[PDB]
Amino acid sequence: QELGTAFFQQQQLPAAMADTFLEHLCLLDIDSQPVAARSTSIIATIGPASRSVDRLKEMIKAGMNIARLNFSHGSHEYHAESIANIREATESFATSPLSYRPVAIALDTKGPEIRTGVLQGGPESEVEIVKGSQVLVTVDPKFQTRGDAKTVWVDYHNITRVVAVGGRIYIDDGLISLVVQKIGPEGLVTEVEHGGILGSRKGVNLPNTEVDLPGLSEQDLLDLRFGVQHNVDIIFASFVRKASDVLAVRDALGPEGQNIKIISKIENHEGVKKFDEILEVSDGIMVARGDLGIEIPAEKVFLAQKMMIGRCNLAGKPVVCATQMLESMITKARPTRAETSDVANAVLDGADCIMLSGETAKGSFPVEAVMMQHAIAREAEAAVYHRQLFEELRRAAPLSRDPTEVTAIGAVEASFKCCAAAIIVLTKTGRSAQLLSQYRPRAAVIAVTRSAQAARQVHLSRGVFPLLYREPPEAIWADDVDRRVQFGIESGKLRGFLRVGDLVIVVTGWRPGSGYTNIMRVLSVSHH
Amino acid sequence: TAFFQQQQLPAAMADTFLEHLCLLDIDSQPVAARSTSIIATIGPASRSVDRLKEMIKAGMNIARLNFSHGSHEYHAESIANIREATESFATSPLSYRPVAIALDTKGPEIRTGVLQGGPESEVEIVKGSQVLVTVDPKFQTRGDAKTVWVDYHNITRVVAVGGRIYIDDGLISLVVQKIGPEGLVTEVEHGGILGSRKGVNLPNTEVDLPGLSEQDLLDLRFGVQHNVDIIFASFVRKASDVLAVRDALGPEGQNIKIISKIENHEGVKKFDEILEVSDGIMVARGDLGIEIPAEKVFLAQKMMIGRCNLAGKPVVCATQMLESMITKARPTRAETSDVANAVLDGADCIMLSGETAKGSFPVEAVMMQHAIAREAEAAVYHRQLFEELRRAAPLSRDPTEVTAIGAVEASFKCCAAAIIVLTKTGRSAQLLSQYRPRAAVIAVTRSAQAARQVHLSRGVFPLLYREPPEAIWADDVDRRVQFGIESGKLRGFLRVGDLVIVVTGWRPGSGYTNIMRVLSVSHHHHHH
Amino acid sequence: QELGTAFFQQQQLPAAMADTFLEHLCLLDIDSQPVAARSTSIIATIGPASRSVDRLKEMIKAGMNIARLNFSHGSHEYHAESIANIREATESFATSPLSYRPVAIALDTKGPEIRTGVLQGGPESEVEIVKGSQVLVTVDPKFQTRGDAKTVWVDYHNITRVVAVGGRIYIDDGLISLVVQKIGPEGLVTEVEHGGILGSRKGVNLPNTEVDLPGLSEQDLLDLRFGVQHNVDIIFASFVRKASDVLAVRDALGPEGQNIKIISKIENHEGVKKFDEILEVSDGIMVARGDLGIEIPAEKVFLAQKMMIGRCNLAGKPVVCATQMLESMITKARPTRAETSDVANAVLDGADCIMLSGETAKGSFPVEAVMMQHAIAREAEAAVYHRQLFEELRRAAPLSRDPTEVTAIGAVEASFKCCAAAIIVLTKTGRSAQLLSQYRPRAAVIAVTRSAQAARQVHLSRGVFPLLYREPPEAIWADDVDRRVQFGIESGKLRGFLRVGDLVIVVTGWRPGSGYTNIMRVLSVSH
Ligand SMILES: Nc1ncnc2c1ncn2[C@@H]1O[C@H](COP(=O)(O)OP(=O)(O)OP(=O)(O)O)[C@@H](O)[C@H]1O
Ligand SMILES: Nc1ncnc2c1ncn2[C@@H]1O[C@H](COP(=O)(O)OP(=O)(O)OP(=O)(O)O)[C@@H](O)[C@H]1O
Ligand SMILES: O=P(O)(O)OC[C@H]1O[C@](O)(COP(=O)(O)O)[C@@H](O)[C@@H]1O
Ligand SMILES: O=P(O)(O)OC[C@H]1O[C@](O)(COP(=O)(O)O)[C@@H](O)[C@@H]1O
Ligand SMILES: O=P(O)(O)OC[C@H]1O[C@](O)(COP(=O)(O)O)[C@@H](O)[C@@H]1O
Ligand SMILES: O=C([O-])C(=O)[O-]
Ligand SMILES: O=C([O-])C(=O)[O-]
Ligand SMILES: O=C([O-])C(=O)[O-]
Ligand SMILES: [Cl-]
Ligand SMILES: [Mg+2]
Ligand SMILES: [Mg+2]
Ligand SMILES: [Mg+2]
Ligand SMILES: [Mg+2]
Ligand SMILES: [Mg+2]
Ligand SMILES: [Mg+2]
Ligand SMILES: [Mg+2]
Ligand SMILES: [Mg+2]
Ligand SMILES: [Mg+2]
């Protein structure tokens, strides 16, 4: 009502109050400055360009929420040191819960993939595959660490039997195309159709093939155990084809790994086909557009993205958009017009998380890349048409008898009614926060938890801002609850989420332990 | 399985109103408690203590006393019998049904005199005949088929030649030929059988009458003195009329609900300003259907009900709803349809006049309104209604308003059997009712008057709590909540395994409602 | 803009342009006068009160479109007299051959029903059945025309067996309730639970019983042959319980009766159960609330009504709302508040036709009952929320490869874009008009036909105004088409449907014969 005239001209609120989508579009305003904290989480792949403690400190300040460790590269020893560095940088800000941001760690698996070998000049070297040249693809292990511009080793022994003369071999998410001329004892003699810069251990994709490949290799098992031992938060499971891939991963993690979240990467035609069964048994999904867009026609990937994000939004499960989002920023300080558009559109499509790969793992501007995802996402989030979104989730979602579910829809609705600055929720596992996130409030969901791991893992859900509460239980449980709510309000103040006289929605439960969230309260923020 | 086939839920799921209509099913039994209150006019057929007990059991919520007829003593008698009948059930507080008492004013009505042959005589007014309309005192008790006396003395200076004079629910029509010293010489345009003291209507004649007459002031005084809950104020033409009623009621009468009756053209014209200053509205279809064309009344009804639904204020549909049941045991097909459509239009209350005041079947008239309303309430298209009311309601920083919408949203998500709310004045209950939930709003109150008055708001079931305050206020709050659930179970509104939403406040006194909770109803008598 | 902003204040146009239903209600305005011609057709039942040529003429002036003959009453001879008087009244206006109104004739069957006998005194007489008294229900032929306050005859010979002791016999749409005390040789001796005034030949309804009645009795077959031989337009087929019932009717009408519309009456529980298979093989539906309201619980009838009209509107097939709509006007000059509201809500529910029974058949105010239905229907039509109704039909209905379908939706959309005063359609059978009527245009459908029967029959679909074209062909077909269209336009001007400067939509076909409608044009009304 009377927060000010100015209030209703900010954060695209004229567009928010449109009666149609079309009218909503027409009312978008470049001069309407975003106000809410950026809610879509940024995942940054950690490699040579992003490994130092100093650099990780600036990536955290720029907006990094989740660090991705790609086990298709490096080694256990390398990734262990990456983790050490991440945790040093993260904990450097723990001095005062004023700038303390949890950072989650994700292990991205190799999975049923085909990779090239390490070049002659070593794992950080490159060679130029030239258009028109002859290239031998070999399976002879003597070439495993001795690849160059003429001979490429591959780790799938059976390629020779499986690829046809005149057939294509693609390298590095389709960067390089080889056409098979001849088959024989030496391997596959190819001509380079499209050339480029080949690095070490690059992905190999084979059109017109149905390679049966284990699913969990012996290396995969070592990698998941490494994950459990180093207490990673998330598994990004590569090339999930079917439900049983997800269950195999859940099995190998074991009961000690039971709390680790599994985000299934959809990277091929089969995964898209079996999406429903995959999503059912997964904690969430990654639209892995690098592999996907060379496994399926490039012009079709956007249908897959929009569909999978839609379905995850409906299921209330985290979804990640990935790969080539700000690609040009590997060598330039500013992105292309298509790249800003792609990020904005991933937020508008409804992604919980967006991701940087080469842009942060090996590029010249890792910090700028994080900064740019931050700035775009914050603008896109203000432009979501919540009215239609919320209305469509009501119409489409099932009825629920779960009291936390019921509480969360009422809490979010209440947050719109009064333009609440935040919804403060107590959560042991993240779940009560996740169930608020699914209705996409404009209000920040501030999740207060004692669980360090839950604080990291809630970054998967758009708009959940974790606060690690560190005080030991009060003598009286009601007083412990109150102190945690007050903690959320005061961190809200000091982080600029709240000010005296804002309204907040508070979501609690009626007893200790998980699953008893059933209370929604409306509070005015005051001084003491 | 069976659950989803009742309460017209197949029709409730429909994607369009059209498909909703197509899916309505006569075999789908309502299960909700009846939410549209029944106002029964009390008179000869309905004032014995025994009859009134049967009428309470049939569903009567509000007793109307029509002060167009009967002495003060006759009305005081009716009140004592109503209170006796009501209080006969008070030895069962979990089942006790409050009954409100409404005083309907005489207002500026015009009536004919007594006939020569006295108050049981009747005379034929023949069409084509000349009849004088006189205000000569000597004709007050000497009416015949050629002279009719009228109690509006100023009628002879206010009805110009060519003016129409309607008598007895508009069934007799006179057209003025001349204004003489003897009065209005007229011609019978429509004829009929005329009795004593019959209502007169003067449409397209602006009357001089005061608004509050000396009798009205006596009658409003009587109202305060006998602690009536509601004034139905006859012939409200403008906002100043409403304020005159509020002033006469005095400081003693401040809490009495004023429901303005819209009975003529000017009242429709000035509806908006009238509704502003009133607690609610009655579509008084009897007078209105003579004052304006009969074939336009349905537009005024639907307009007024809509605007009231928009304002979150109670609206009453009245007059001739089950008219035939004055003499017959079963109503006409038009009459059942009238009742159902009043509910579907959005009426909070429906009314019975002659059918309960003087007819042969008062109890069965009440039973019939009960049964129809139940069927119609199940058939309301909530999906559309809820959205349109959500969207039309303004943003609010008032926590009662914020919590109300969260609780109704929540009710809909779990198909909650009830919303239980504590209220001192009825307001927190009204703010739920205004979103038209399918769930029953069980209002728990210590105030006997509020318990009576909340019957004006659709879907509010008052429970009068009688226990002395617990020493700890939170305990007192909890006892009332558990009392609401236990009354709910006993009256069969709630069964074990149902979810209820509970609505409470953070301190004592009106205006601090701010908490919504989700409970399960257990077999046990304490719930969580 | 340049219609004059007075145009956007009449006809409930502010309410028409609401964004929501709720806003639409809030904008309804009693000072906003209707301007369109009344589109919901009025069916009047013809009996004692409506027999004379002068009376029928007045009923036609008041707005009667269909005359209903109830063969549960009278005799062949009686209805032949009625028909002759209806046609003489109808043809008395053929003088000015564009103020001629076709009037359809509907034969309403007995069907599988039970009825009481003729009283002592004859079919004009009445007796009071007194509450508490003892009444004998008998199957003895000697009481067949000898009924009184104490013995009532019924034409279901096997009634002694189907009704238990302590079971209810309802008479005249539930007006009278009898409870069976004892079962014996004379019949059933009953005590009167609810009394009332009994006439001759009143409906008997038996709750919690099954009766074995054929579907088409020997009398039904005689009555349908009568209908064919007297060139009736419509059969209102009583107590349609299943799809086979409709097909039997269609069989009995035979090749001679091919073009007669069957409107199936839904009046009991089985009929509601089997609605979908009945509507499928029927030309239309009647919601027969008299019987229906004593066969099922009275508080349920409104659900059945709204469901059935909703489904008919979706199937694009005409539906009639019937019985007790203006009941009090049997004795009173003015209706009750419930009655006006009922008529309005029938129209707002989407009924194509509204009906009068006793109000015109036997009451004191037949003409004023018709006038009242006319007045209400006209107000209610302007209050339809076209915006939502069109949208939901578009969403709900199937796609179609039929050129007439495709053209109709186009035409109606075009009618809205320009506020066309009329859509003019050429039709042989009415089908092309009907397919426009299903989208409920605010614009009048002026249907130009050479078929007198079609011109009577199209009254069944809301918004269709028939113009019977009388001229003989032109050498060139295309010239004949253009003259029929010109007839439409000049007829609309004269009747005040149209003025110079109105737009009209014109719907035509590419060749003669039925089934080839496929053209829509936008014309300015000339000179
Ligand atoms: N830990 C690392 N050490 C060295 N180089 C790395 C590391 N992580 C990533 N890279 C480099 O950055 C590139 C892009 O990273 P990204 O994580 O997308 O891997 P990818 O090879 O495309 O496989 P995926 O399909 O799993 O994304 C890699 O191809 C590799 O050249
Ligand atoms: N042709 C007629 N001759 C004499 N009286 C008639 C005739 N038609 C109708 N009536 C009178 O009007 C009443 C109502 O007319 P209506 O056509 O509704 O008949 P009904 O008995 O109600 O049977 P249905 O269930 O077919 O309507 C009849 O019961 C009868 O008293
Ligand atoms: O989101 P989750 O994991 O269900 O946890 C929410 C739980 O948190 C609480 O607010 C607090 O529980 P604790 O005191 O055990 O932290 C409970 O009332 C509620 O059931
Ligand atoms: O509906 P109202 O009149 O505002 O009353 C609601 C009030 O009832 C309560 O729930 C209980 O108050 P009391 O103990 O004064 O009855 C308050 O917490 C709340 O403000
Ligand atoms: O509505 P129906 O019976 O299908 O009639 C539509 C027919 O009327 C016409 O406009 C004219 O046909 P006729 O010339 O045979 O009268 C045809 O073009 C069209 O197929
Ligand atoms: O694996 C990925 O991240 C991809 O392929 O996009
Ligand atoms: O006073 C009334 O209730 C009326 O006139 O309808
Ligand atoms: O038969 C009828 O017309 C009825 O019963 O309503
Ligand atoms: Cl009786
Ligand atoms: Mg990988
Ligand atoms: Mg790859
Ligand atoms: Mg990649
Ligand atoms: Mg990949
Ligand atoms: Mg009064
Ligand atoms: Mg009145
Ligand atoms: Mg019949
Ligand atoms: Mg009838
Ligand atoms: Mg019938």
JSON list of C-alpha atoms and ligand atoms in Angstrom, two decimals, chain C residues 68 70-72 108-111 113 115 236 238 265 267, ligand 16:
[
{"chain": "C", "resi": 68, "resn": "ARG", "atom": "CA", "xyz": [-47.01, -28.04, -27.77]},
{"chain": "C", "resi": 70, "resn": "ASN", "atom": "CA", "xyz": [-49.85, -33.02, -25.03]},
{"chain": "C", "resi": 71, "resn": "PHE", "atom": "CA", "xyz": [-51.22, -36.41, -26.05]},
{"chain": "C", "resi": 72, "resn": "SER", "atom": "CA", "xyz": [-51.42, -37.47, -22.40]},
{"chain": "C", "resi": 108, "resn": "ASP", "atom": "CA", "xyz": [-45.67, -34.55, -26.86]},
{"chain": "C", "resi": 109, "resn": "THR", "atom": "CA", "xyz": [-46.09, -38.33, -26.43]},
{"chain": "C", "resi": 110, "resn": "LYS", "atom": "CA", "xyz": [-47.51, -40.35, -23.54]},
{"chain": "C", "resi": 111, "resn": "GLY", "atom": "CA", "xyz": [-44.54, -42.72, -23.48]},
{"chain": "C", "resi": 113, "resn": "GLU", "atom": "CA", "xyz": [-46.19, -43.47, -18.12]},
{"chain": "C", "resi": 115, "resn": "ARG", "atom": "CA", "xyz": [-52.04, -41.93, -15.53]},
{"chain": "C", "resi": 236, "resn": "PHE", "atom": "CA", "xyz": [-41.20, -34.34, -27.59]},
{"chain": "C", "resi": 238, "resn": "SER", "atom": "CA", "xyz": [-41.77, -38.58, -22.99]},
{"chain": "C", "resi": 265, "resn": "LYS", "atom": "CA", "xyz": [-37.51, -35.76, -22.58]},
{"chain": "C", "resi": 267, "resn": "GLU", "atom": "CA", "xyz": [-37.81, -37.15, -16.61]},
{"chain": "D", "resi": 16, "resn": "MG", "atom": "MG", "xyz": [-46.94, -36.22, -22.21]}
]
